[PDB]
Write a protein that binds this ligand. Structure first.
Ligand SMILES: CCCCCCCCCCCCCCCCCC(=O)OC[C@H](COP(=O)([O-])OCC(O)COP(=O)([O-])OC[C@@H](COC(=O)CCCCCCCCCCCCCCCCC)OC(=O)CCCCCCCCCCCCCCCCC)OC(=O)CCCCCCCCCCCCCCCCC
Ligand SMILES: CCCCCCCCCCCCCCCCCC(=O)OC[C@H](COP(=O)([O-])OCC(O)COP(=O)([O-])OC[C@@H](COC(=O)CCCCCCCCCCCCCCCCC)OC(=O)CCCCCCCCCCCCCCCCC)OC(=O)CCCCCCCCCCCCCCCCC
Ligand SMILES: CCCCCCCCCCCCCCCCCC(=O)OC[C@H](COP(=O)([O-])OCC(O)COP(=O)([O-])OC[C@@H](COC(=O)CCCCCCCCCCCCCCCCC)OC(=O)CCCCCCCCCCCCCCCCC)OC(=O)CCCCCCCCCCCCCCCCC
Ligand SMILES: CCCCCCCCCCCCCCCCC[C@@H](O)O[C@H](CO[C@H](O)CCCCCCCCCCCCCCC)COP(=O)(O)OCC[N+](C)(C)C
Ligand SMILES: CCCCCCCCCCCCCCCCC[C@@H](O)O[C@H](CO[C@H](O)CCCCCCCCCCCCCCC)COP(=O)(O)OCC[N+](C)(C)C
Ligand SMILES: CCCCCCCC/C=C\CCCCCCCC(=O)OC[C@H](COP(=O)(O)OCCN)OC(=O)CCCCCCC/C=C\CCCCCCCC
Ligand SMILES: CCCCCCCC/C=C\CCCCCCCC(=O)OC[C@H](COP(=O)(O)OCCN)OC(=O)CCCCCCC/C=C\CCCCCCCC
Ligand SMILES: CCCCCCCC/C=C\CCCCCCCC(=O)OC[C@H](COP(=O)(O)OCCN)OC(=O)CCCCCCC/C=C\CCCCCCCC
Ligand SMILES: CCCCCCCC/C=C\CCCCCCCC(=O)O[C@H](COC(=O)CCCCCCC/C=C/CCCCCCCC)COP(=O)(O)OCCN
Lengths: 156, 128, 603, 459
């Protein structure tokens, strides 16, 4: 039960055309800004702010409380990206750049120190363990018809 | 003085730290009035259609249908071949294929060469 | 004859009867939770017998009853392995599950779908039993996926809550990342050793190469919530308290460590994988302990404690002491289930409040709960001659005297100090100060179910460590002689952590206020790992899923190449051909032209 | 075989002389009876085949597909019983006639001891499908979808006819037994390369291969429910069955002619799995899932190892059943909602619990959960590709993770959450839909007990 005019249309250079589209999408004429006329097929669809959908007012009486949406309002091109079940752009207590710097620094320092500790291992002042029968030759692999070189152990 | 909060794409500027609503002019108040007016008009229409005892169906949402049509069936008619679109298409649709072909071809060539030399130790490799 | 096999199969069989009866009439009454609890108790008391027989003789057995299918030279059969690990882990898991079900009969009395909750718990228990007793890699994979699916179903217990669905999907995502490595290992083992059975795998692989072991380590990291894939375990607390007490505390999360234990004959033969798993365990235990230091939600703190213990047993695997890791699994089950049950008791008594900022004086208000929590915390920190001691003390001793990485040594020591510190934080902030809960005091624990369930695990966490330690044959070379300063390093570092945490927590009484430092913000926000890693990758991937894959390639260029170009060319040719004005002058001129062309060309 | 073909033919006079209010009952009963008769074909032997006569033969590859084809028709009738309530008797009888003709053509196709007869019926299966899509379709795009489905298939399959008649002229026979016994190597030449391309492209277009899959989302979205299930369950397996039958004469050229198709499939599985994540439609999401699974089957067939073939057959059967179930569930949702949009109706688990259970089971099966035959085929193909090259595991694991992600996304968006407020026509689910879901799912959990029945001739 929807007319042809209601459906999305190609990006319009003219102001009169722009005004018609802004009225169609139920938003103010100077509040409407389409995607740039590039090769991609956005056409005549408003470029709503990339503001997420988790951080909408949680106390407003939305028509769809779970999605935080109102009936009839324009829908973001990437709503399925922001449904509170996926990526959200909620402002964080610490800046994004400093968060990335701190996390990368911690991980890199941990890796470097693990490698350094691998270079300088830790052990105890003991000699290698001694096993009686030719370093347990028969019990490790077998091959009894080869008569391996016999290793003797030094009592001290 | 305190360190400044620098917003990013995935951490947007908070409304409280935003400076747009501190430089208030009468036209801004008029704009907010019009926004609230159209929002209330839509809300009144929805509520009138929603509490009707005679209605026994789903309230058709023009916004949802418009969004679905824009996402699915309106991409090609607004598509134009441009250097950006052409380059992105060529890259993202050709590069991965040839990259994976080169990787697998090199791996299989190395494996076949090792097989021909016989230095692979394929013992117990019964199932294939 | 030899009741070992009969009883070891009968326990797993009797665990299944209520699932069959779930379509009967008893499912529609209020008798179902008690029915399931009694069934689990009977299964535990029946499975207690093979443990005694193994202790007396050293019985080991594998049963391959049903032959599923043969693929040329490979045979897949329903094979159960009943070695030391399985016969010892059956009773512990059944005991913990029995206590948790009895606790849930009180915690979840108001839930309309309580019967479904108990059925889900039983299904998870059955799947974990299958995973533990599995003998070939396919059955192990069956259990591996079943426990993950049950965790997904139980995390999102409340469908209305969006965070529950988010946490469930996150857990599934990380478990699939681990399953990638699991499947890699399975495929390598089949294509090289020609068998998924553990016996042939052990025999044919004297020097196991790097690839299957790296795959197994990736799977263990995925399911045991190591540093690379840790956040799903702390995020899995959106489910009911009994679920997080049984699944994501002591039984399901030790599946990766158990997988690494099961393949210990191959682990010893490789040196790079041992180093990698030791490093992973060290980094993850330090990171989760550091995060737990400053957490404010009680369940979050205990979840991070669980993650730290998981990292500690991964470290134990790294220094090539798998049996010690199994022992620590057994002890940690007891006392961590205790801690979660006490936390659930507090939460229910304080009207579903979880922040420790609103828990005040409960040392006198809830005497049994505080005594149980104190005993559990002292066992966790490693108090001598308790359940946690017999495992953790030996872990630290063996780690101190092995040719291992030094940074792992330091990280483990700091991690156990921080363990003591956050145990102190829990006790001090939830049982010592003045009350801070709302005025309507609804404190009540006088319910036989809760008291009995707590006291059973109390007796367990007091005596089971001693009993198990002294009632099993030796499997590791003892560290008889050690330096005195290094002999006490665990106790000294634990006492230092206690003192430092208490002294720093007592300073919150002083009437001074100061903005947090960068270290506090880093530790409270979980190293900023959940933020960035859940916003930078996901978004980008999803972006591509709509930009490159869906619109640009499928809807634009793939359409332009084959169908649209053909349509355009045929339309243009049709327009060109069919556009004739109907003049016979042009027709006959073309006829003359073609007559001339055929006359001079085709001859 | 005629004990199967003859009753299917007699279904037509049975339907056309039935009473106006008893066509569905008779068609369902006799279709189920026919399925029971088809069960006898499953008992294959380790030797050559069940060579019934000079025209029809049955193998252990044809037996599972034949049983699935005969079993699908009652489900198609129960699915179509809903939206054909307000249809005249003649048009309902024509619909049942089209379904019966489709089943008969598929049954004659799957045995088809001679390759030209196989091709003739393989293209004959195209007319009833096109009529069903373009006649009993709701949307106005059914015409374009029908044109795409016709032309994508026919353009690929037309060179196949020339290749087949050429092979008959040189080899001298197209009987599959003679073709298998007298097979000779194909030399590396341009003519042989183009013969390979002609013989392969006709089946790769129908599977479909990534890059030629544009017809499948349109055909699946615009078709009615029965057309959707017959497309997703059986009509996609025609290409794979033909490819596994015809790769016996393309050796050893395939050893290096499989690289473009292997790369295309191993990347298109990832691409379509990612596409499924960002989808505003349910039927489109299921169609793209089918494309991903069929790309995996293409990889398996092109590897050409015994484990590859076994996994390919298992995945064929499992994906057919799972996709049919998912399309059934989507149709039941669409009938009440009348919108066909994923986020328009939410939280349906609170209102319809048993349908939520069916949704969960279907999603778990699609998620390739052990020990279901979905994972059996998946894992066999994974091991075979790992033997082919150790680096394929990266792509396959990525596909597995994305598959789990989009399956649980489909479950969560439509079942969990808070219900939509402005929808008050969600009537309780009928017995017909519950029975349809049960009959879809129970054969899967039963076949997981006897995998050897669906593992193909190389078992
Ligand atoms: C199967 C699995 C998936 C695979 C399938 C998907 C992937 C494969 C298929 C899709 C990709 C194939 C596309 C390749 C060719 C298509 C280009 C096309 O059709 O032209 C239409 C379109 C028609 O031209 P137009 O409408 O008259 O002019 C409109 C522009 O505003 C006028 O633009 P301009 O004049 O300002 O600039 C044009 C100029 C400037 O070009 C550039 O800006 C940078 C140079 C890029 C190309 C050279 C490297 O270009 C050149 O001089 C370079 C010539 C070489 O041409 C373009 O707009 C694009 C021009 C640049 C060509 C780039 C193509 C190279 C891709 C790699 C090969
Ligand atoms: C663990 C083994 C148990 C064996 C006992 C015998 C059970 C026979 C069941 C056969 C298949 C069930 C039929 C499917 C539709 C269910 C009908 C229904 O609508 O339910 C309503 C009905 C009445 O409830 P209501 O309140 O009126 O309805 C409210 C709503 O429906 C609300 O519904 P809800 O909230 O109550 O949930 C419905 C429930 C039920 O719905 C389902 O999801 C059932 C389907 C689960 C399978 C998922 C697909 C994955 C592929 C597995 C294929 C294995 C099949 C083996 C042969 C099967 C023979 C038919 O869903 C679940 O609980 C979650 C299931 C996820 C389990 C993941 C673990 C799978 C692998 C475990 C190992 C399997 C092989 C063992 C090998 C080694 C050990 C020997 O509830 C039930 O009947 C529940 C049945 C028990 C659940 C069985 C789940 C696991 C068993 C799978 C097959 C057994 C393997 C043989 C081992 C024997 C030892
Ligand atoms: C062989 C000799 C054996 C003897 C060895 C030595 C004996 C003991 C020596 C003592 C050593 C430290 C003991 C004090 C611990 C610190 C406590 C403290 O002062 O906190 C207040 C203060 C800030 O607190 P606030 O903001 O005022 O708190 C707000 C309210 O109080 C809000 O308060 P609230 O109520 O919300 O919660 C308070 C909570 C919140 O407190 C926190 O904020 C947590 C932060 C403290 C954790 C640090 C402890 C261990 C650090 C390990 C780091 C691993 C490497 C990481 C590398 C990162 C690289 C970027 O604090 C606590 O609950 C207790 C804190 C933990 C104390 C108990 C355990 C500590 C003893 C174990 C450590 C050393 C003994 C090892 C034993 C083994 C023998 C070797 O913390 C600090 O200032 C940080 C001090 C240490 C941070 C080191 C990292 C600096 C990195 C800077 C950049 C470097 C260059 C990187 C270049 C990279 C290039 C790629
Ligand atoms: C306790 C018992 C447990 C097991 C019970 C198993 C029962 C199985 C019943 C299902 C059978 C499936 C159908 C099998 C059809 C394939 C075989 C069929 O084609 O054979 C035909 C024969 O079919 C039978 O004559 C008729 C069977 C049809 C009915 C099967 C039983 C169930 C029918 C139920 C119909 C509805 C019942 C009433 C509902 C109201 C022709 O045989 P023919 O090629 O010459 O044999 C040559 C070899 N000879 C010479 C040695 C014989
Ligand atoms: C788009 C969606 C998918 C559609 C289907 C895609 C699959 C079609 C791709 C065709 C597969 C390969 C075709 C040819 C393979 C032979 C190997 C050859 O290409 O490599 C070199 C061949 O050199 C050059 O490639 C010659 C051919 C160059 C002209 C072919 C067109 C290349 C680009 C066109 C792409 C268009 C594809 C889609 C058309 C609509 C090796 O040189 P040489 O060893 O001496 O000759 C080997 C053959 N011998 C031994 C018999 C003599
Ligand atoms: C490898 C990269 C894998 C590609 C990831 C694909 C993700 C895209 C689709 C996932 C669906 C999106 C989604 O579910 O939302 C993100 C969801 C919501 O975030 P929350 O923190 O839970 O919100 C709580 C507050 N409301 O969070 C997630 O689940 C994000 C999961 C993405 C994980 C990506 C990071 C993985 C990095 C692994 C590297 C380590 C390898 C292992 C090391 C061990 C080696 C021996
Ligand atoms: C139940 C009620 C009846 C109780 C009285 C009967 C008690 C047992 C007497 C029956 C005799 C034993 C019997 O059933 O026969 C064996 C018979 C199989 O025959 P075989 O020849 O040995 O192997 C198949 C190839 N021919 O065994 C059985 O089927 C019964 C026991 C099988 C185990 C039960 C099923 C559990 C697993 C379900 C399937 C799960 C998926 C597959 C698992 C994957 C494993 C890698
Ligand atoms: C040598 C030449 C070889 C020719 C091969 C013929 C390919 C068969 C398809 C030809 C269809 C061309 C007809 C056409 O596109 O007309 C434009 C037409 C206008 O619509 P009408 O209904 O005609 O008018 C209504 C509005 N007034 O455009 C369309 O809508 C197209 C809709 C259906 C398109 C189907 C295309 C599917 C083809 C897929 C690839 C197959 C190509 C075959 C050759 C393969 C390459 C070797
Ligand atoms: C969804 C759209 C897909 C379109 C598929 C169309 C491409 C199919 C592949 C080519 C089809 C034509 C092949 C010819 C049929 C095979 C017959 C044969 O093998 O005989 C050869 C003949 O080989 C040929 O004649 C081939 C000529 C090809 C002419 C038509 C070209 C069509 C387009 C070619 C490029 C397409 C390839 C990639 C297509 C990808 C899909 C778009 C042997 O010649 P002899 O006479 O016996 O010589 C022996 C003595 N020396």
């Amino acid at each position: 039960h929807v007319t042809k005019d209601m459906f999305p249309g190609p990006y319009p250079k003219t102001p009169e055309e722009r005004a018609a589209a802004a009225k169609k999408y139920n938003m103010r004429v100077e509040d409407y800004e389409p995607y740039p006329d590039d090769g991609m097929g956005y056409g005549d669809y408003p470029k709503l702010p990339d503001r997420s959908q988790q951080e909408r007012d949680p106390w407003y009486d939305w028509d769809h409380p779970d999605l935080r949406l109102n009936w009839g309002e324009p829908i973001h091109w990437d709503l399925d990206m922001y449904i509170r079940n996926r990526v959200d752009t909620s402002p964080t207590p610490v800046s994004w750049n400093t968060m990335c710097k701190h996390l990368f620094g911690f991980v890199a320092f941990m890796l470097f120190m693990f490698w350094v500790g691998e270079i300088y291992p830790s052990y105890q002042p003991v000699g290698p363990k001694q096993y009686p029968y030719n370093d347990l030759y028969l019990e490790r692999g077998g091959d009894p018809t080869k008569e391996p070189e016999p290793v003797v152990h030094y009592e001290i | 003085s305190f360190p400044k909060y620098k917003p990013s794409r995935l951490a947007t500027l908070p409304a409280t730290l935003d400076p747009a609503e501190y430089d208030i002019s009468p036209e801004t108040r008029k704009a907010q009035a019009e926004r609230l007016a159209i929002r209330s008009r839509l809300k009144r229409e929805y509520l009138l259609q929603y509490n009707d005892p005679n209605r026994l169906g789903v309230i058709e949402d023009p916004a949802l249908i418009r969004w679905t049509y824009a996402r699915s069936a309106n991409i090609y008619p607004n598509f134009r071949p441009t250097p950006k679109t052409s380059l992105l298409g060529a890259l993202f649709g050709i590069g991965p294929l040839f990259f994976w072909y080169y990787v697998f071809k090199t791996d299989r060539d190395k494996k076949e060469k090792l097989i021909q030399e016989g230095k692979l130790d394929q013992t117990f490799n019964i199932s294939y | 004859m030899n009741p070992f096999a009969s009883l070891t199969l009968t326990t797993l069989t009797i665990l299944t009867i209520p699932i069959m009866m779930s379509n009967s009439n008893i499912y529609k009454t209020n008798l179902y939770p008690n029915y399931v609890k009694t069934t689990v108790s009977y299964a535990f008391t029946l499975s207690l017998v093979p443990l005694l027989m193994f202790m007396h003789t050293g019985q080991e057995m594998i049963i391959s009853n049903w032959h599923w299918m043969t693929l040329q030279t490979v045979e897949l059969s329903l094979s159960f392995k009943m070695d030391y690990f399985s016969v010892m882990f059956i009773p512990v898991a059944l005991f913990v599950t029995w206590s948790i079900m009895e606790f849930s009969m009180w915690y979840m009395h108001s839930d309309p779908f309580i019967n479904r909750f108990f059925k889900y718990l039983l299904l998870f228990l059955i799947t974990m039993m299958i995973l533990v007793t599995a003998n070939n890699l396919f059955q192990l994979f069956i259990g591996w996926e079943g426990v993950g699916i049950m965790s997904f179903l139980l995390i999102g217990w409340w469908h209305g809550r969006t965070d529950a669905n988010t946490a469930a999907l996150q857990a599934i995502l990380y478990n699939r990342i681990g399953d990638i490595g699991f499947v890699l290992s399975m495929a390598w083992f089949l294509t090289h050793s020609n068998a998924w059975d553990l016996q042939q795998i052990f025999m044919l692989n004297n020097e196991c190469p790097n690839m299957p072991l790296i795959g197994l380590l990736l799977a263990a990291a995925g399911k045991s919530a190591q540093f690379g894939l840790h956040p799903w375990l702390p995020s899995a607390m959106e489910g009911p308290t009994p679920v997080s007490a049984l699944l994501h505390s002591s039984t399901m999360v030790v599946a990766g460590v158990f997988l690494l234990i099961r393949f210990y004959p191959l682990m010893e033969t490789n040196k790079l994988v041992q180093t990698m798993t030791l490093c992973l365990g060290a980094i993850t235990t330090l990171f989760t302990a550091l995060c737990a230091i400053t957490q404010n939600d009680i369940k979050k703190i205990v979840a991070f404690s669980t993650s730290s213990q998981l990292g500690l047993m991964m470290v134990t695997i790294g220094i090539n002491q798998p049996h010690l890791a199994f022992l620590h699994i057994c002890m940690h089950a007891f006392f961590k289930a205790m801690l979660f049950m006490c936390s659930g008791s507090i939460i229910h008594s304080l009207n579903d409040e979880q922040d420790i900022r609103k828990m005040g004086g409960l040392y006198k208000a809830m005497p049994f709960t505080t005594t149980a929590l104190i005993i559990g915390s002292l066992a966790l920190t490693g108090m001598p001659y308790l359940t946690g001691f017999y495992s953790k003390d030996l872990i630290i001793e063996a780690v101190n005297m092995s040719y291992t990485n030094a940074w792992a040594l330091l990280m483990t020591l700091i991690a156990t100090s921080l363990t003591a510190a956050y145990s102190t934080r829990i006790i001090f902030f939830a049982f010592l100060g003045k009350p801070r809960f709302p005025p309507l005091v609804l404190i009540n624990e006088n319910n036989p179910l809760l008291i009995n369930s707590i006291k059973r695990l109390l007796i367990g966490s007091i005596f089971a460590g001693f009993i198990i330690s002294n009632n099993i044959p030796p499997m590791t070379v003892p560290n008889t002689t050690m330096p005195l300063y290094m002999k006490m390093t665990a106790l000294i570092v634990t006492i230092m952590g206690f003192m430092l945490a208490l002294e720093l927590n007592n300073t919150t009484y002083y009437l001074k206020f100061k903005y947090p430092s960068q270290t506090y913000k880093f530790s409270n926000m979980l190293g900023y790992y959940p933020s960035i890693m859940h916003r930078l990758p996901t978004y980008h991937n999803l972006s591509m899923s709509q930009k490159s894959a869906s619109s640009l390639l499928d809807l634009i260029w793939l359409e332009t190449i084959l169908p649209k170009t053909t349509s355009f060319i045929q339309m243009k040719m049709s327009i060109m051909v069919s556009n004739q004005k109907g003049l016979i002058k042009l027709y006959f001129l073309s006829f003359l032209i073609t007559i001339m062309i055929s006359m001079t060309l085709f001859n | 075989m005629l004990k199967i073909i003859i009753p299917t033919t007699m279904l037509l006079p049975m339907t056309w002389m039935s009473k106006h209010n008893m066509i569905w009952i008779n068609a369902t009963v006799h279709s189920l009876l026919i399925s029971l008769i088809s069960l006898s074909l499953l008992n294959q032997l380790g030797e050559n085949s069940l060579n019934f006569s000079l025209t029809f033969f049955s193998d252990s590859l044809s037996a599972p597909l034949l049983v699935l084809t005969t079993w699908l028709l009652p489900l198609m009738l129960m699915a179509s019983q809903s939206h054909l309530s307000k249809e005249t008797t003649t048009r309902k009888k024509l619909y049942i006639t089209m379904l019966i003709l489709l089943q008969l053509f598929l049954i004659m196709t799957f045995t088809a001891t001679e390759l030209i007869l196989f091709y003739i019926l393989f293209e004959a299966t195209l007319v009833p499908t096109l009529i069903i899509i373009t006649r009993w379709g709701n949307q106005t795009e059914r015409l374009n979808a029908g044109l795409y489905f016709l032309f994508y298939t026919l353009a690929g399959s037309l060179p196949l006819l020339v290749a087949l008649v050429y092979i008959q002229n040189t080899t001298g026979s197209l009987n599959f037994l003679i073709i298998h016994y007298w097979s000779h190597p194909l030399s590396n030449s341009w003519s042989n390369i183009f013969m390979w391309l002609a013989c392969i492209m006709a089946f790769m277009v129908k599977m479909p291969l990534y890059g030629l899959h544009l017809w499948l989302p349109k055909a699946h979205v615009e078709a009615p429910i029965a057309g959707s299930m017959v497309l997703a369950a059986v009509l996609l397996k025609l290409g794979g069955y033909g490819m596994m039958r015809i790769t016996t004469i393309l050796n050893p050229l395939t050893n290096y002619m499989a690289y473009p198709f292997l790369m295309l499939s191993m990347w298109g599985m990832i691409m379509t799995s990612s596409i499924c994540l960002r989808q505003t439609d349910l039927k489109s999401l299921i169609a793209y899932s089918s494309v991903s699974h069929m790309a995996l089957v293409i990889v398996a067939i092109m590897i050409q190892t015994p484990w590859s073939f076994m996994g390919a057959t298992a995945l064929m059967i499992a994906h057919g059943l799972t996709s049919s179930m998912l399309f059934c569930l989507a149709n039941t949702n669409y009938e009440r909602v009348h919108s066909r949009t994923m986020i328009l109706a939410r939280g349906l688990q609170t209102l319809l619990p048993l349908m939520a259970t069916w949704w969960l089971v279907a999603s778990l099966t699609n998620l390739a959960l052990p020990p279901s035959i979905n994972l059996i085929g998946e894992l066999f193909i994974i091991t075979a590709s790992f033997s082919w090259s150790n680096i394929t595991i990266i792509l396959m694991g990525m596909n597995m993770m994305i598959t789990a992600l989009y399956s649980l996304y489909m479950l969560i968006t439509t079942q969990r959450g808070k219900y939509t407020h402005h929808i008050n026509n969600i009537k309780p689910s009928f017995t017909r839909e519950n029975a349809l879901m049960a009959l879809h799912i129970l054969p899967l959990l039963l076949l997981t007990l006897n995998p050897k029945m669906i593992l193909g001739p190389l078992y």
